[PDB]
Coordinates of C-alpha atoms and ligand atoms in Angstrom, one line a residue:
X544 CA 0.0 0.0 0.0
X545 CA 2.0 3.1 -1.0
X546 CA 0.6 6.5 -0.2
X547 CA -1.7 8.0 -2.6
X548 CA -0.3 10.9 -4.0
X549 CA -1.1 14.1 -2.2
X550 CA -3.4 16.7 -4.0
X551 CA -2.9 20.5 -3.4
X552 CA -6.1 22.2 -3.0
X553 CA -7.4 24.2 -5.7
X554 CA -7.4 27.8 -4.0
X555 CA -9.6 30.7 -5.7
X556 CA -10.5 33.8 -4.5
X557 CA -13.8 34.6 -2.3
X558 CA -16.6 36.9 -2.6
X559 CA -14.0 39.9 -1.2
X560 CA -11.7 39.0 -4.2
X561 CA -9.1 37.8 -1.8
X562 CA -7.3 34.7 -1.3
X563 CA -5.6 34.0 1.8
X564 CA -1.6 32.0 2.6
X565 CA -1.0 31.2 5.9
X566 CA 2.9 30.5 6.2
X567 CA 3.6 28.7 9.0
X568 CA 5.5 25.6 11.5
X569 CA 3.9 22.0 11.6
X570 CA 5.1 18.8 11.6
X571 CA 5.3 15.8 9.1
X572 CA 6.0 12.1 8.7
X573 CA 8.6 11.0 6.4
X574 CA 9.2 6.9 7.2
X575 CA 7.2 6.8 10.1
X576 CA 9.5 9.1 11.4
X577 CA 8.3 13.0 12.5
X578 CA 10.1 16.1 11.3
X579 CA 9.8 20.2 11.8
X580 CA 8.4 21.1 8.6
X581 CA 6.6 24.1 6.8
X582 CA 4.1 25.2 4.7
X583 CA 1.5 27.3 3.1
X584 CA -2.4 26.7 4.2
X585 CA -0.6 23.7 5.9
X586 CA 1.9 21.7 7.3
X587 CA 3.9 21.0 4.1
X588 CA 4.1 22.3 0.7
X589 CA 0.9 24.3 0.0
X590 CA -2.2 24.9 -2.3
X591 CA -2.7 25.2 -6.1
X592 CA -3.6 29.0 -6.6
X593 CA -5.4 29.4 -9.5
X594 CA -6.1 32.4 -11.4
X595 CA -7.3 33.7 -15.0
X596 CA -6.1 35.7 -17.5
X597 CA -7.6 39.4 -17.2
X598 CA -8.7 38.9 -14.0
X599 CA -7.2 40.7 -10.8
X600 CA -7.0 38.8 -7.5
X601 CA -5.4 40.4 -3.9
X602 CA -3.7 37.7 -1.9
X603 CA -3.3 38.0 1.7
X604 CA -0.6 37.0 3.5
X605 CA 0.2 35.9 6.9
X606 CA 3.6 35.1 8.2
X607 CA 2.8 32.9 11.0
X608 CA 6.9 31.8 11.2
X609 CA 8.9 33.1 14.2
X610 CA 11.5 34.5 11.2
X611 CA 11.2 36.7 8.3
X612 CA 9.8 35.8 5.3
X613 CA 9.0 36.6 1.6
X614 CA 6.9 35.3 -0.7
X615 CA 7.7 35.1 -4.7
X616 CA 5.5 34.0 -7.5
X617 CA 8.3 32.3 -10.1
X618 CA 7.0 32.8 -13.3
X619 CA 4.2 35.6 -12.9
X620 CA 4.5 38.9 -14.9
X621 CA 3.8 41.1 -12.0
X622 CA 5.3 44.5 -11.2
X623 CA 8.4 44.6 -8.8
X624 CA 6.3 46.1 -6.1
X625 CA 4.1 42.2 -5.8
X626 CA 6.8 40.1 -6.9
X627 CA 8.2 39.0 -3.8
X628 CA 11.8 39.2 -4.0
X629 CA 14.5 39.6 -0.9
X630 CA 12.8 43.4 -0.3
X631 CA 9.1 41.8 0.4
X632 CA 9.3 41.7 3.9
X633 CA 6.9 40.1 5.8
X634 CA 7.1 40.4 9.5
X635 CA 7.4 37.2 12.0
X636 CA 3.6 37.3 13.2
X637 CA 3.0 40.2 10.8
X638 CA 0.3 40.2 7.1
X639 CA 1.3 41.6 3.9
X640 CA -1.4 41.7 0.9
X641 CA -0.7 42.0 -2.8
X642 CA -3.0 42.5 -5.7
X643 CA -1.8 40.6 -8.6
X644 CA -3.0 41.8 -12.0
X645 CA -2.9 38.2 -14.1
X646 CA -2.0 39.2 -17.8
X647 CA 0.0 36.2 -19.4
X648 CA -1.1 32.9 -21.1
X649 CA -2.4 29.8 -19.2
X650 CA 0.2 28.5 -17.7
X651 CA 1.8 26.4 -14.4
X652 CA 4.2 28.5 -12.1
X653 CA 4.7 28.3 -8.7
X654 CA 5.7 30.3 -5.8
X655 CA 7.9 30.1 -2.7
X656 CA 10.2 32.0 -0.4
X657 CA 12.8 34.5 -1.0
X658 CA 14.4 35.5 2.1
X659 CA 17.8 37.3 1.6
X660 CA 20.3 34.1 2.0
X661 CA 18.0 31.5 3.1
X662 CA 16.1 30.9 0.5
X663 CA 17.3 27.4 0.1
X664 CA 16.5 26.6 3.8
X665 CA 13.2 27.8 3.6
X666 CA 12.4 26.0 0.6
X667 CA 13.9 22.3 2.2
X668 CA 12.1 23.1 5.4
X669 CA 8.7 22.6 3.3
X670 CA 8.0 26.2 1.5
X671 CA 6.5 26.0 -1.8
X672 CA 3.0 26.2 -3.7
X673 CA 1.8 25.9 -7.3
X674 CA 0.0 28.7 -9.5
X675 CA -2.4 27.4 -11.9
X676 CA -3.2 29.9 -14.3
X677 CA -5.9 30.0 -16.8
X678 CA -7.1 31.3 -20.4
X679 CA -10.0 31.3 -22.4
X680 CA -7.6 29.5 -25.4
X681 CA -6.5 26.7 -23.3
X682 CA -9.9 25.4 -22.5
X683 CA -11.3 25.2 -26.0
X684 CA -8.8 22.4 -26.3
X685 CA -10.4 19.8 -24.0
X686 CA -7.0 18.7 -22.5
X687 CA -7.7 16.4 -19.1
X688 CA -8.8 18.8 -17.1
X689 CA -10.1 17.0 -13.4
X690 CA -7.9 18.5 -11.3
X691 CA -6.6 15.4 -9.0
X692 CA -7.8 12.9 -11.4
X693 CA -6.8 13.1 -15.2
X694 CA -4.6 16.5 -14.4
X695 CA -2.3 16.3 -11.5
X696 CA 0.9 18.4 -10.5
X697 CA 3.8 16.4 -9.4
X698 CA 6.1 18.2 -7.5
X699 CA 9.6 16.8 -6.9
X700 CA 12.1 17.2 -4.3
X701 CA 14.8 15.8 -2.4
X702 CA 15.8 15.8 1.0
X703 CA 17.9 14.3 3.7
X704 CA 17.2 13.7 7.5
X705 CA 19.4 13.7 10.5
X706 CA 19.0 10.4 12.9
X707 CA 16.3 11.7 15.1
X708 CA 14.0 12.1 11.9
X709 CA 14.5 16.2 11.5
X710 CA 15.1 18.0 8.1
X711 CA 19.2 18.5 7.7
X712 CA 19.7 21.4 5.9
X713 CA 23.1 23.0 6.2
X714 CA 24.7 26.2 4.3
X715 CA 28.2 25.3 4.8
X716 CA 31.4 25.2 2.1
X717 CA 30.5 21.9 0.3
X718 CA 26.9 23.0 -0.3
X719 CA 27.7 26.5 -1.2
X720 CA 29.9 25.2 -4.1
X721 CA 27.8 21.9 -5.0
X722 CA 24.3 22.2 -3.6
X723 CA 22.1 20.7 -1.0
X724 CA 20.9 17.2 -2.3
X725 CA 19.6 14.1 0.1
X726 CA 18.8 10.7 -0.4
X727 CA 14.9 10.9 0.0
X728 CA 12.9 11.8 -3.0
X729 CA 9.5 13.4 -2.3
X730 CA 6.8 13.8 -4.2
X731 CA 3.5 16.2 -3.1
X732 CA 5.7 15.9 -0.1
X733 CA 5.1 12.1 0.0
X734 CA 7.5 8.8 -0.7
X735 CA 6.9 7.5 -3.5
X736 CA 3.2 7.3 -3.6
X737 CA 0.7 6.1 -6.6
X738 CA -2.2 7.9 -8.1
X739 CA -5.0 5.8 -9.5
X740 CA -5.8 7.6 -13.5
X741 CA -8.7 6.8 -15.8
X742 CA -8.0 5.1 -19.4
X743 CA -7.2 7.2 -22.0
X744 CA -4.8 10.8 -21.5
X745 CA -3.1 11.8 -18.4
X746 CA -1.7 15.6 -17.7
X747 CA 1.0 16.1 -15.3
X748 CA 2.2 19.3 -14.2
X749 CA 5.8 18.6 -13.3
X750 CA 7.6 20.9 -10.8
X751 CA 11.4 20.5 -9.9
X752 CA 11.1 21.7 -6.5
X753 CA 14.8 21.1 -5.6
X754 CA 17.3 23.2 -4.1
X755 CA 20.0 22.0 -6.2
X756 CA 19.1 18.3 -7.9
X757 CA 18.6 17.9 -11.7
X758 CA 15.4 15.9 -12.9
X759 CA 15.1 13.9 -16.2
X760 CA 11.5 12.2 -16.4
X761 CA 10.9 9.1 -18.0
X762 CA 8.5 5.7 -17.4
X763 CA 9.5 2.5 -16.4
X764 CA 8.1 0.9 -19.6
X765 CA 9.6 3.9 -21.8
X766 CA 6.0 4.8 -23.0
X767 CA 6.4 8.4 -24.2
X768 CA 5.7 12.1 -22.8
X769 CA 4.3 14.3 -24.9
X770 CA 5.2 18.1 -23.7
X771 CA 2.6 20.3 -24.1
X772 CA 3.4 23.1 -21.9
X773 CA 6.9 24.5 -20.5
X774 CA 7.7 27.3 -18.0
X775 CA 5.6 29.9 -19.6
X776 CA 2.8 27.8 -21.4
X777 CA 1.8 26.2 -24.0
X778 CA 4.0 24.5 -27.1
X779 CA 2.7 25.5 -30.3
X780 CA 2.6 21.5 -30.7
X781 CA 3.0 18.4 -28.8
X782 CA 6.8 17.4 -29.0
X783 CA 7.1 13.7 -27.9
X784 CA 10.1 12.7 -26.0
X785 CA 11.3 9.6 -24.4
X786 CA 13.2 11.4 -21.7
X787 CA 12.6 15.0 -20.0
X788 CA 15.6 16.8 -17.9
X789 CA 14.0 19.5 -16.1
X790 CA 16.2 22.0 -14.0
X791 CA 15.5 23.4 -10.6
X792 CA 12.4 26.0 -10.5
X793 CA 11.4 24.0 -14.1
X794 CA 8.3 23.1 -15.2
X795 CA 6.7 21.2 -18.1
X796 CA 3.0 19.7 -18.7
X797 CA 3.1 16.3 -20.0
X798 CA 0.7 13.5 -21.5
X799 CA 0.6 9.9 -21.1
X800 CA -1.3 7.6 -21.8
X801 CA -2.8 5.0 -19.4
X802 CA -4.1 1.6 -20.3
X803 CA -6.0 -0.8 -18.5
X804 CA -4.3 -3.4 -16.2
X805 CA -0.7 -2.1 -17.0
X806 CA 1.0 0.1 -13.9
X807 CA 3.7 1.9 -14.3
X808 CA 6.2 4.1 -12.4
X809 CA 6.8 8.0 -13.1
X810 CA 11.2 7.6 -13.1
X811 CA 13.8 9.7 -12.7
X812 CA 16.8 9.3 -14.3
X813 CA 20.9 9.3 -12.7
X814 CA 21.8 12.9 -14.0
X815 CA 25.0 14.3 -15.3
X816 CA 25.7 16.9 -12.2
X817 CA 28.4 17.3 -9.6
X818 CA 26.9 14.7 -6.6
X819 CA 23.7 14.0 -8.1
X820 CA 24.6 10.5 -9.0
X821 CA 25.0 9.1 -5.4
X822 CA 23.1 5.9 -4.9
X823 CA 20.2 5.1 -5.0
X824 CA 20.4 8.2 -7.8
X825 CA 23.1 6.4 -9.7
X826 CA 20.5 4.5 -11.2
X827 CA 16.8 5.2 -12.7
X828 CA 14.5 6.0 -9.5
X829 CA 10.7 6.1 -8.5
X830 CA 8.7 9.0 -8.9
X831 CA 5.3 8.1 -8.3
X832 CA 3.2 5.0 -9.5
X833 CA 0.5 5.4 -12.0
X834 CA -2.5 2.9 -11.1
X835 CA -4.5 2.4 -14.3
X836 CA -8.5 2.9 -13.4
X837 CA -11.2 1.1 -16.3
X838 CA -12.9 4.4 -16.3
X839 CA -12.4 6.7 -20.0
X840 CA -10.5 9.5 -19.5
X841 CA -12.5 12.8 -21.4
X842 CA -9.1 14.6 -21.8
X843 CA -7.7 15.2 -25.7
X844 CA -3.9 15.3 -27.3
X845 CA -4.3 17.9 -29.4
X846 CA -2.3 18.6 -32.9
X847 CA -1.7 21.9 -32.3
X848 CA -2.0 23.9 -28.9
X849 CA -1.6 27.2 -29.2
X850 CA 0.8 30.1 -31.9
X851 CA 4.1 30.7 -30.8
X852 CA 5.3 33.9 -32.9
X853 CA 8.7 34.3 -34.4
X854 CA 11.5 35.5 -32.9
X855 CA 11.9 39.0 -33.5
X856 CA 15.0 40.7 -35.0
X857 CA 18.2 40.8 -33.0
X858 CA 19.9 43.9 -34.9
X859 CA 19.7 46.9 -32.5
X860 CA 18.6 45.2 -29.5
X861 CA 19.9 46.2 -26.2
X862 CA 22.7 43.6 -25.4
X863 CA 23.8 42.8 -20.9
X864 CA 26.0 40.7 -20.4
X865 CA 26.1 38.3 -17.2
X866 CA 29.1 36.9 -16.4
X867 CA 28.7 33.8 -13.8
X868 CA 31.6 32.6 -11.2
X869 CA 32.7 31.1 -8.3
X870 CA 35.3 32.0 -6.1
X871 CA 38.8 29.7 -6.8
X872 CA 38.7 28.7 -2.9
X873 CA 35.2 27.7 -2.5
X874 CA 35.5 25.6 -6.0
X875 CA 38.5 24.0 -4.6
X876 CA 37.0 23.4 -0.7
X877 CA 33.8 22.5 -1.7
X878 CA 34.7 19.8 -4.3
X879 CA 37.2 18.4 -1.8
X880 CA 34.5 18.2 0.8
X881 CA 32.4 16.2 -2.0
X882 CA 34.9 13.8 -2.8
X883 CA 36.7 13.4 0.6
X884 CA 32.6 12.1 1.6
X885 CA 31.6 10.4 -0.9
X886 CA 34.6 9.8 -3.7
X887 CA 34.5 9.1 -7.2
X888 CA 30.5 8.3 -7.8
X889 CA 30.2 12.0 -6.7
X890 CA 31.7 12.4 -10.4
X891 CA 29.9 9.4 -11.8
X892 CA 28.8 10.0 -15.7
X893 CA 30.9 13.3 -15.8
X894 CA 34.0 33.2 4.0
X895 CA 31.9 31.2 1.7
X896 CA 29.1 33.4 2.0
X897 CA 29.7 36.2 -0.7
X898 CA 32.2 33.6 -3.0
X899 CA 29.3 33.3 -6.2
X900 CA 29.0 36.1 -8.2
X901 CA 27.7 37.5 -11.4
X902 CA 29.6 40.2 -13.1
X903 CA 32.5 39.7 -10.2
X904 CA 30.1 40.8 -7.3
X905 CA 28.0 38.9 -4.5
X906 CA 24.4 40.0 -4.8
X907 CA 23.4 43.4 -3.2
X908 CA 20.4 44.1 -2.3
X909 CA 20.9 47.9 -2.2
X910 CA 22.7 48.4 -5.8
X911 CA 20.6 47.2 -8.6
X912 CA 22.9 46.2 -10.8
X913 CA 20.9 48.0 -13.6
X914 CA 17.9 49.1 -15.4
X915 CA 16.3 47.4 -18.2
X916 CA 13.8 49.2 -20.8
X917 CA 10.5 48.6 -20.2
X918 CA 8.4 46.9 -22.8
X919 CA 11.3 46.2 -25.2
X920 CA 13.3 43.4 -26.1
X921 CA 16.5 42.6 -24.8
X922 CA 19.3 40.2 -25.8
X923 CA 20.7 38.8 -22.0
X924 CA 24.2 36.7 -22.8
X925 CA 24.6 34.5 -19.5
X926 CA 27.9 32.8 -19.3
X927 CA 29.7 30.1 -17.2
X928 CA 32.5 29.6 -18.9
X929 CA 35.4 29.6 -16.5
X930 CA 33.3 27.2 -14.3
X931 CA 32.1 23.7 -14.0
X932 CA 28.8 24.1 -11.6
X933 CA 25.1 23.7 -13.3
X934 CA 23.6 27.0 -12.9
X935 CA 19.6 26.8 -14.5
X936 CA 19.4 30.8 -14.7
X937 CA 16.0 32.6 -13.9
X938 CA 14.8 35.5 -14.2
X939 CA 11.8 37.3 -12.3
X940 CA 9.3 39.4 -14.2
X941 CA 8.9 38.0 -17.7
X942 CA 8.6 34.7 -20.1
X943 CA 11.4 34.7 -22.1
X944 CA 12.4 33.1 -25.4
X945 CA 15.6 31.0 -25.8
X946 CA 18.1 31.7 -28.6
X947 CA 20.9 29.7 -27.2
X948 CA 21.3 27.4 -24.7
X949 CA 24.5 26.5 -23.3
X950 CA 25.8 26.9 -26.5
X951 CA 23.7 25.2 -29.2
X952 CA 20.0 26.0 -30.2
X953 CA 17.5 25.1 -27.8
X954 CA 15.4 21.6 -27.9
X955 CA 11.7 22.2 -29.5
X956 CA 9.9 21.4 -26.1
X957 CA 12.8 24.0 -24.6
X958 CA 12.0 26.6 -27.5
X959 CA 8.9 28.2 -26.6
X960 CA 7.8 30.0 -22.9
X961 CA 10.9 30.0 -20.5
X962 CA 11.8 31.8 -17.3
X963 CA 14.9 29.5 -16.5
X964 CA 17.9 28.6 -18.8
X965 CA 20.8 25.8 -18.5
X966 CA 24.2 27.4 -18.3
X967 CA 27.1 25.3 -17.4
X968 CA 30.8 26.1 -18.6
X969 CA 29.3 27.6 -22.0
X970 CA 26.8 30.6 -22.9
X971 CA 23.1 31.1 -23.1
X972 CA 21.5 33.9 -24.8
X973 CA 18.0 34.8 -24.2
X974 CA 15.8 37.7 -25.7
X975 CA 13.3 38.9 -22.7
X976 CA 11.0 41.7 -22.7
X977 CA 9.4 43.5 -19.2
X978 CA 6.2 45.0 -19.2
X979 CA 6.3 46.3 -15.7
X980 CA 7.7 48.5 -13.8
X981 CA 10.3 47.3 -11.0
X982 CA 11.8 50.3 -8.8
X983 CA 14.9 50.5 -6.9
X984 CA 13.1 49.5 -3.5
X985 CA 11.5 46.3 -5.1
X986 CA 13.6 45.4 -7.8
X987 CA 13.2 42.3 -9.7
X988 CA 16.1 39.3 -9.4
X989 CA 17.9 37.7 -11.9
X990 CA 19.6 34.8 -10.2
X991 CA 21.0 31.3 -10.5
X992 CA 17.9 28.7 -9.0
X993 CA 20.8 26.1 -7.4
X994 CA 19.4 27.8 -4.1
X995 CA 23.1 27.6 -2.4
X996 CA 24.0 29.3 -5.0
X997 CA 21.9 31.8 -5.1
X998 CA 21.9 32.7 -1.4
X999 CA 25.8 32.8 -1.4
X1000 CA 26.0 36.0 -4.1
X1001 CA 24.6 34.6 -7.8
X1002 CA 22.3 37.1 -7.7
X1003 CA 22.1 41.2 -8.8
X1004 CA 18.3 43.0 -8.5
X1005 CA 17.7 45.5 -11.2
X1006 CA 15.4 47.5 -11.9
X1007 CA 13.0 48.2 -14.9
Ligands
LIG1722 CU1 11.3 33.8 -9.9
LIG1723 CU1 0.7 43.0 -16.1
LIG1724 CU1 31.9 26.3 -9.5
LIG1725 CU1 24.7 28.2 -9.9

């Protein structure tokens, strides 16, 4: 009897136009064994907040932690002043409200916390909710659509416990310069868990919820996924894959198809990344299980989804430069650190608190690093040449198209609607374009999503 997998609430907003997050401390059971964790509406994780196009909605939130917090909605088009960044301060015991002004295509994003270097521990510690947004375009195409049924998120995440069952998160050298990865994969928040599905199409909304730990999706009987949806939205088309890497922060909608009397298991594949591979991840591990149920599934494939418009013209357009690194010192400690605990298989397929930068400096909070133009196209050129770390680059306030990633041209299911971008030891280009305003006082973030990363300097603010 595994666990069935756990289904977020759907959250919209009441008859006041308000929907409210309570952030606070609870306890879970991972193993039978009871840990300290966190989350929104709840003990763990948090709801599904959806919302729809053209439509306005004010969120309420309460801080009900005895620390600071902030709360961040990755992959919404919001002004600076909502968007939650490190200047979003909410009080311990105190309520801020925003009024969010959805204007972007349907869509899954997701929010969590963004508190100014401890981002990562407030994420591991249980932080972290999903955004469902809606169109009037989406629905004409009768995709599954029963939300917990035929269309289910599946949020993924590792972590790793101490003996007496609690949460060991720890922003020290090694994780600074490699990450902080466990040994437990969760999904919804729950071990490996199955979901029963009717015959006929299922839609998961997959969310890499790790701090620092590469995904790549695949089925145990290597039936196919067929994308329909990445960071941003919709695919112009369904692009069928056999296997689906997905980055921290990441998400993609999927298909598959699910037949009567065959299970199968949701996998994850060993990844190509500094540590990720360390048993069980050196091989291919469960994600979930997918029960079949001899009920027909309404939900459609459809051959085309949505237009995706050309990418405009390059001459002329405002050109920044990001230049990503890591101190010498922390490379050199932190790998040692790796190897000295784990050796070789931490290699297998291949003051430490300011030491990642971008453009040589540790993130700071009161020196925007610049200004973008507002409304127009920009050409960003992110680089990690000069280092070996995966750095999956985000950046608030926008859906961006890819032009180059990590030095070739971007996959089909990776060429539509992206807010994050691989760079490791080579270049990405991406054209982005802001249509809101973000001020010095709430600037937006453009950041590396390995979270030790970020909360150790791979970060500026700027503004817009
Ligand atoms: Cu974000
Ligand atoms: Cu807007
Ligand atoms: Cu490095
Ligand atoms: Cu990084």
């Amino acid at each position: 009897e595994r666990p069935t997998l756990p289904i977020p609430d759907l959250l919209t907003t009441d008859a006041r136009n308000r929907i409210q997050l309570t952030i606070g401390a609870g306890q879970s059971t991972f193993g039978g064994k009871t840990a300290t964790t966190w989350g929104y509406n709840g003990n763990l994780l948090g709801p599904a907040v959806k919302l729809q196009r053209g439509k306005a909605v004010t969120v309420d939130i309460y801080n009900q932690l005895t620390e600071e917090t902030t709360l961040h909605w990755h992959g919404l088009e919001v002004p600076g002043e909502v968007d939650g960044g490190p200047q979003g301060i909410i009080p311990p015991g105190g309520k801020r409200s925003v009024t969010l002004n959805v204007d972007q295509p349907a869509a899954t994003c997701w929010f969590h916390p963004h508190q100014h270097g401890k981002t990562g521990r407030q994420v591991a510690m249980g932080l972290a909710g999903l955004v469902v947004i809606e169109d009037d375009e989406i629905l004409k195409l009768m995709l599954p659509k029963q939300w917990g049924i035929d269309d289910v998120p599946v949020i993924v995440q590792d972590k790793k416990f101490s003996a007496d069952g609690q949460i060991d998160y720890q922003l020290d050298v090694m994780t600074a310069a490699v990450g902080w990865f466990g040994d437990t994969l969760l999904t919804n928040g729950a071990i490996y868990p199955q979901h029963a599905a009717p015959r006929g199409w299922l839609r998961l909304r997959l969310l890499n919820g790790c701090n620092a730990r590469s995904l790549n999706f695949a089925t145990s009987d290597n039936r196919p996924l067929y994308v329909i949806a990445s960071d941003g939205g919709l695919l112009p088309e369904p692009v069928k894959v056999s296997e689906l890497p997905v980055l921290m922060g990441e998400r993609f909608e999927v298909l598959v198809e699910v037949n009567d009397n065959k299970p199968f298991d949701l996998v994850t594949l060993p990844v190509s990344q500094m540590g990720m591979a360390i048993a069980p991840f050196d091989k291919p591990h469960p994600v979930m299980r997918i029960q079949p149920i001899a009920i027909s599934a309404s939900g459609a494939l459809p051959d085309t989804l949505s237009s995706l418009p050309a990418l405009p013209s390059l001459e002329g357009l405002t050109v920044r430069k990001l230049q990503l690194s890591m101190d010498p010192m922390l490379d050199m400690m932190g790998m040692q650190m790796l190897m000295e605990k784990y050796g070789d298989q931490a290699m297998a397929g291949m003051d430490f608190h300011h030491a990642n930068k971008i453009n040589g400096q540790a993130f700071d909070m009161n020196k925007p690093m610049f200004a973008a133009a507002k409304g127009q196209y920009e050409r960003w050129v992110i680089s990690g040449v000069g280092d070996m770390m995966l750095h999956p680059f985000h950046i608030h306030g926008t859906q961006f198209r890819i032009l180059s990633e990590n030095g070739k041209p971007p996959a089909a299911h990776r060429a539509g609607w992206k807010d994050t971008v691989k760079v490791e030891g080579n270049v990405s280009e991406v054209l982005v374009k802001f249509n809101h305003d973000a001020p010095k006082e709430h600037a937006y973030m453009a950041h590396c999503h390995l979270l030790e990363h970020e909360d150790t300097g791979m970060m500026l603010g700027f503004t817009v």
